[PDB]
Amino acid sequence: LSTTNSTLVAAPVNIEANSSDTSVVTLTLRDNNNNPVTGQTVVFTSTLGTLGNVTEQASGLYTATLTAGTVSGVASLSVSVGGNALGVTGNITLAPGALDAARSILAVNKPSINADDRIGSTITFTAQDAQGNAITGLDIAFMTDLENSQIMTLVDHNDGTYTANINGTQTGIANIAVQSSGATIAGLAATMVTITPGAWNTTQATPVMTVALPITTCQSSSGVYKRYYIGIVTHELYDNYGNEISGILTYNLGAGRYTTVTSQNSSVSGSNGLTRRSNSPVSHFILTSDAYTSQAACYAERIANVNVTITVTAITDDFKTSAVNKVFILGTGSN
Numbered sequence: 001l002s003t004t005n006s007t008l009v010a011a012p013v014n015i016e017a018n019s020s021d022t023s024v025v026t027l028t029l030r031d032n033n034n035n036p037v038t039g040q041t042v043v044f045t046s047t048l049g050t051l052g053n054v055t056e057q058a059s060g061l062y063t064a065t066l067t068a069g070t071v072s073g074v075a076s077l078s079v080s081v082g083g084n085a086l087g088v089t090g091n092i093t094l095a096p097g098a099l100d101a102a103r104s105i106l107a108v109n110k111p112s113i114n115a116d117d118r119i120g121s122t123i124t125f126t127a128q129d130a131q132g133n134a135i136t137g138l139d140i141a142f143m144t145d146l147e148n149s150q151i152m153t154l155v156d157h158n159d160g161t162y163t164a165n166i167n168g169t170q171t172g173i174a175n176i177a178v179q180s181s182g183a184t185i186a187g188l189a190a191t192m193v194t195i196t197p198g199a200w201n202t203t204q205a206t207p208v209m210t211v212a213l214p215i216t217t218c219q220s221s222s223g224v225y226k227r228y229y230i231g232i233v234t235h236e237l238y239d240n241y242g243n244e245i246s247g248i249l250t251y252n253l254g255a256g257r258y259t260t261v262t263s264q265n266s267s268v269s270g271s272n273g274l275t276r277r278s279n280s281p282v283s284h285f286i287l288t289s290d291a292y293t294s295q296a297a298c299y300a301e302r303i304a305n306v307n308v309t310i311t312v313t314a315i316t317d318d319f320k321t322s323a324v325n326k327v328f329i330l331g332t333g334s335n
Contacts, residue, residue: 001037001081005030008079008090010066017094017133021068023049025077025090029060036060040081048075048094072096072133096129099138101185104128104160106178108191113167114318115241116198120152120167123176123191127160134160139181142166146174146195148241168195171243198239200247200317208278209234209249211310211328216284218298225298226290229258229268230306230330232283234276237315247278248316253285254334256308260301268308270334309334 007028015021025044029037037060044051044064052065066075077090105128110121123142127135140162142151149168156162168174176191177184214228237245253270260266268287276283292298310328314321 001029001040001086002032002034003087005032005034006086006088008077008086008088010075010077010090010092012092014093014095015068016097017048017068017070017072017129017131018097019067019070021094023066023068023092025051025064025066025092027062027079027088029062029081041083043080043083045078045080046075046092048073049092066092068094070131072129072135096131096133096135098130099135099180099185100128100130100132101187103132104185104188106176106188106191108166108176108193111192112194112196114196114198115167115169115171115239115243116319118167120165121193122163122165123151125162125178127162136160138162141179141182143177143179143184144168144174144193145177146170146172149174149195166193169198169241169243171195171197195243197243197245197318198241199319200237200245200315200322201240202322204238206238207235208237208315208326209251209310209312209328211308211330213306213330214284214303216282217302218292218295221286221290224290225292225295226286227292227298227302228284228286229303230256230285230308230310232276232285232310234278234280236279245278245318247318249276249278249312250274250314250316251276251310251312254309254311256306256330256334258303258306258308261304262301270308305331307331307333307335 010023010025015023031037042054042062049066049069054064072094074091074093079086105126107124108121113120136158142164148170152165154164174193210233212231217228218225237247251274252272255270257267312326314323
């Protein structure tokens, strides 16, 4: 038999990988003169599907029925005549068909990343047929629910997986979604990507701290009422985009001097290494020396003016401890 004058082919060349989809494997057989050859014992061996029994045909043709199994790919058809392998090729593609959202997996490598990082995190999808086979060529598309977050380039990896990165300037949690050919998947593992605050804007307009005189005073601290020296309040911090950063402030109390409603003028030694969080409510610095037993007495001695220098010396970005120098005065300030 001639290799060039013979053909091994199966149609439909593409059949869905269900247990039913059949195919006909035709072996056109001829001799070196191209004259057909008849009366030969042939055997077909495929790499997929179930082959029926072989049968002779007219013009020197032979056939077997390949019922599609349940696996996607290309069934490589090999053939042997009279127990001798024939050097003709042939195959058939087993198509997966539809997509199975149950066992197809969606996951992000990083559940969080900062708004400064333009690369962000990679979304990974794994398309799978009902029978667990990959599905390629799908018009996949990812999506997000957080504003100012962008889905980046997408890839059909030709293996059932489709990936794409995401990054956002606006802080928040960005759930992930997917759709194929304008059709969104229903039941899929919820996947989140939280946008961490970026880098604090060194050129920030707003203030960060507010030192004030005491109003609230004369309350049981150590079981006794003490006069409150000063009060500290902090505010929000912002990256270059404006998302609230939650950082740490490092300030130093100055050698302050105050005056009480009785006209006395005392001094309070400053202190270094003080810390407080941003956007924090009032921190009542109390005279650690007080020991008043009567809320009335302490109130009849409350502080009327404080002259101290409060100096913020460092801020803690989400990626480094930036140094600064912001001062805040009450009255004339420390001397």
